[PDB]
Ligand binder design. Structure first.
Ligand SMILES: O=C(Nc1cccc2cccnc12)c1ccc(N2C(=O)[C@@H]3[C@H](C2=O)[C@@H]2C=C[C@H]3C2)cc1
Ligand SMILES: [Zn+2]
Length: 207
């Protein structure tokens, strides 16, 4: 059911999406170990993901959440990185494929910092890096992230160094030590996120 619509670099949508990618890069405490050393990306392609069934299941869940939260879905646009992006855009997010550990357990993770989601493209801690060079800082190989519409509803606040807690619809991971880090978010039900944009990019070696 999925079609991918290529956006042109002068489309206003391409530009606002690229600006959110670029402007949310930060430095990471691993000094670039997991995601590579970079201050900006080379954006190669932004595609709009169109799937009617996945959209209808997103908006249906969104209305349920909203009606339980004084008419407030608390919808955000957030990045998601994982090795399974190409499965996700065809079949939707699935909590059954969620990995057992991590800071917030077996959920589907999103991030406000595109650089945080970039650390997961090749797996946890960056896995072995790119398939071709095994370089977690590869400046050559094309990477992909999703920029996703996510329904958070009443989110449980976790001050920070499976299912949502009872009475909540997601978890907000709130950075409590690092001054520059933005929030991460976790949902436990695949239907509460729609992957709107597939972004293809390279990290760039700083001059
Ligand atoms: O929906 C996901 N994957 C998939 C959806 C639909 C079909 C799939 C088929 C095969 C594999 N994954 C699929 C998915 C769920 C959770 C994660 N996920 C996270 O969000 C966190 C963890 C994870 O597995 C660790 C990797 C990224 C962070 C850290 C990744 C992908
Ligand atoms: Zn490579």
């Amino acid at each position: 059911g999925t079609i991918l619509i290529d956006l042109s670099p002068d489309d206003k949508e391409f530009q606002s999406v690229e600006e959110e990618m670029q402007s949310t890069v930060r430095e990471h405490r691993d000094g670039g170990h997991a995601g590579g050393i970079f201050n900006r990306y080379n954006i190669l392609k932004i595609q709009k993901v169109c799937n009617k069934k996945l959209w209808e299941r997103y908006t249906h869940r969104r209305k349920e959440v909203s009606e339980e939260n004084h008419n407030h879905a608390n919808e955000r646009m957030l990045f998601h990185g994982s090795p399974f992006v190409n499965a996700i855009i065809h079949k939707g997010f699935d909590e059954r494929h969620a990995y057992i550990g991590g800071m917030f357990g077996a959920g589907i993770y999103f991030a406000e910092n595109s650089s945080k989601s970039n650390q997961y493209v090749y797996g946890i801690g960056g896995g072995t890096g790119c398939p071709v060079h095994k370089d977690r800082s590869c400046y050559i190989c094309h990477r992909q992230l999703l920029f996703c519409r996510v329904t958070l509803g009443k989110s449980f606040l976790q001050f920070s160094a499976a299912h949502s807690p009872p009475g909540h619809h997601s978890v907000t991971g709130r950075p409590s030590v690092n001054g520059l880090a933005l929030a991460e978010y976790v949902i436990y039900r695949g239907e509460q996120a729609y992957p709107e944009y597939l972004i293809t990019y390279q990290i760039m070696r700083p001059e």
